[PDB]
Design a binder for this molecule. Structure first.
Ligand SMILES: CC(C)=CCC/C(C)=C/CSP(=O)(O)OP(=O)(O)O
Ligand SMILES: CC(C)=CCC/C(C)=C/CSP(=O)(O)OP(=O)(O)O
Ligand SMILES: [Mg+2]
Ligand SMILES: [Mg+2]
Ligand SMILES: [Mg+2]
Ligand SMILES: [Mg+2]
Lengths: 317, 317
């Protein structure tokens, strides 16, 4: 329950247990009844607290469920596909067509259509994206598809390196982790909050830097909380402390403490860039979106800190 | 110089030789002087005719050069990286950061910055995208990055299959080819034409189907013209006739003729969907963009038909 010592973060209120329970019951029903996700590790309570904590402005549980089904589907892919298969690029492209559809001839379209029911990851993406596309504006859907293309490219860099046991330089690992990253989750904060960050404002270079820094900081949070778990993962699973240690030839402890400082610099930079843009462009949807990304990041730190079933901390302090 | 018999296409005017020559001289200078592309196969005349023919509405050669440097950079990646490396996913993600930049700490940012000069593909993307970002709106830049993420995912499906000599089902091959696809070229037709298709109109589902069908048809054109060349490529290089033949157990000839019919159905569907959207949404930028995608597709068919240095036709008629 303790935060990583020295990790810069902001406390968050206990998530509303009425919403956590309602999310938990509905996501279990979606998993079992609509997409047949499994035949435990899956808990509804875990993801319910996660999403309530990360989206305090959601008007309804229906809004929370848009993010929740997409998070569960993302998990199902990383679980069924990403553990390192040589054939990953083919599997992931076909699953990506549940997110960005295939357009083809009368002959081939139905065969693709049938593939969307073929396994749990595609049933999960097809169904989760279908609820999102109904709720969100076409620009919000397109933005999510781009963030998912980023994430799939991220997985495929990590998998290519794992095929040869390659340890990239630290900045190379960080570049992969900018893509293989929580980013598709905080960037839907506007859809989940029932409003829209207009596309031309999303596309501003300064906003794109804000989003990347937030995703980068909050993904390094996961490196830090999941570091001890990953020591048992197959092969040598990369995370920032492992890569710094191996490339910079540092003991695990000193590498882990430097990773904490890297996280802090990213989090502070995210905050300064967000403050600058809020001043440069104080339109209400921009300010709402920036606050919502911050809330997602703080909520993601809280979930990792409290999830003692998935994570524990190394003995370094 | 002859078109594939039975291939549905539209003739185009001979490209303006004054513009072809000016594009040729400037792209050779960019290649040699700015990005050190090589130490022949590269001709300026080839790509000059290509881009003039595909962008008849470009106001200036500067506009044509925005597309031309990006096409040459795309080629450089496919040439230096894609021929099948196990480490492709890592190489391509790092090159993608020349298109969608890395955001990191004061320590790691400059090391990434130096990597953008490290090889010809990254110097080519960094420089070509830098001219594009200066010219285009932030929404047009963001749209190009998404189309490049699609293309890199496409390469990585093709490379994952090539690692095991896997022949996917035909619709699976077509799904990969929807991504590994000319799409990033016709979708910049508005930037090259000096106007903007507004982002919310680009994101409409019907427009996204139009774009996918156009890219799919015009990419299958390349399968058909490059079929005889690819028979000498390493391994068994996939294209629609090869995949249909191997999965459907047809002789090469009958598979090739069916591929021509598939191309035709995609091209007709593209046209019908474009006509429907022009009627549904007759705003001038939409109608300009649809005409510009059509011109790119017709120009791409013409370039393949006339490029007897890269391509020849099989003896099937
Ligand atoms: C879009 C979503 C949910 C995730 C993006 C990929 C991602 C950041 C997964 C969480 S990080 P990962 O190291 O892979 O997972 P853990 O086992 O450490 O929990
Ligand atoms: C964005 C650009 C230029 C290309 C996208 C990838 C693409 C369609 C390359 C042309 S198809 P490809 O079979 O790879 O090349 P060819 O040797 O047949 O000429
Ligand atoms: Mg992972
Ligand atoms: Mg982890
Ligand atoms: Mg290729
Ligand atoms: Mg080809």
């Amino acid at each position: 329950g303790r935060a990583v010592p020295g990790l810069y973060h902001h406390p968050v209120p206990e998530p509303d247990p009425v919403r956590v329970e309602e999310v938990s019951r509905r996501i279990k029903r979606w998993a079992e009844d609509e997409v047949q996700l499994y035949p435990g590790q899956f808990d509804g309570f875990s993801v319910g607290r996660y999403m309530v904590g990360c989206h305090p402005d959601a008007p309804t549980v229906d809004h929370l469920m848009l993010a929740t089904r997409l998070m569960v589907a993302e998990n199902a892919v990383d679980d069924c596909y990403c553990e390192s298969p040589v054939g990953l690029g083919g599997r992931l492209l076909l699953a990506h067509t549940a997110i960005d559809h295939f357009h083809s001839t009368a002959e081939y379209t139905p065969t693709w259509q049938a593939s969307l029911a073929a396994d749990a990851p595609r049933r999960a993406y097809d169904s989760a994206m279908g609820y999102f596309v109904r709720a969100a504006t076409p620009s919000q859907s397109d933005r999510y598809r781009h963030d998912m293309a980023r994430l799939h490219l991220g997985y495929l860099a990590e998998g290519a390196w794992a095929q040869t046991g390659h340890v990239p330089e630290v900045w190379e690992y960080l570049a992969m982790r900018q893509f293989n990253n929580f980013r598709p989750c905080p960037t839907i904060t506007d859809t989940v909050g029932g409003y829209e960050l207009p596309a031309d404002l999303h596309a501003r270079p300064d906003m794109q830097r804000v989003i990347a820094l937030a995703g980068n900081a909050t993904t390094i949070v996961n490196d830090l909380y999941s570091y001890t778990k990953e020591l048992n993962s197959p092969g040598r699973h990369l995370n920032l402390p492992v890569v710094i240690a191996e490339r910079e030839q540092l003991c695990e402890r000193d590498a882990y403490l430097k990773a904490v400082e890297v996280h802090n610099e990213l989090q502070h930079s995210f905050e300064a860039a967000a403050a600058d843009l809020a001043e440069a462009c104080p339109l209400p949807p921009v300010l709402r979106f920036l606050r919502g990304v911050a809330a997602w990041v703080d909520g993601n730190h809280d979930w990792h800190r409290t999830n003692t079933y998935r994570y524990s901390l190394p003995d370094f302090w």
